[PDB]
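QA checklist item 7 of 12: single-chain prediction sanity check.
[x] sequence parsed
[x] length recorded as 110
[x] structure emitted
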Amino acid sequence: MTLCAMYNISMAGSHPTTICVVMDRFLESFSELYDIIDENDTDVMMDFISRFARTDEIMPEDKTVGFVVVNADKKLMSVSFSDIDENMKKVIKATAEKFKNKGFKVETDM
């Protein structure tokens, strides 16, 4: 089956931005998202998010590994995933820990 995850990034104490991408694209999306996360422009964030997203749900043939909450205003990030595997877990831990290298908090939920 296919597992997807949705992560939201907050540039401040205002309506944050949520995005849903499959694990396969999650790794890449995160890598690029982190490179753009350095900015704080709504146009750049909205353009990147919208360009990286396509507003889609999960089919009955697949499922959603979980969702990740990232708030820059609070400087904290939590990742919640259900029924997963070590294969994808590596990507989740690497992605979460990667943010810590920038000076943030990483939390794991399972």
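[x] summary fact logged: Helices lie at 23-36, 42-52, 86-100.
[ ] second reviewer sign-off
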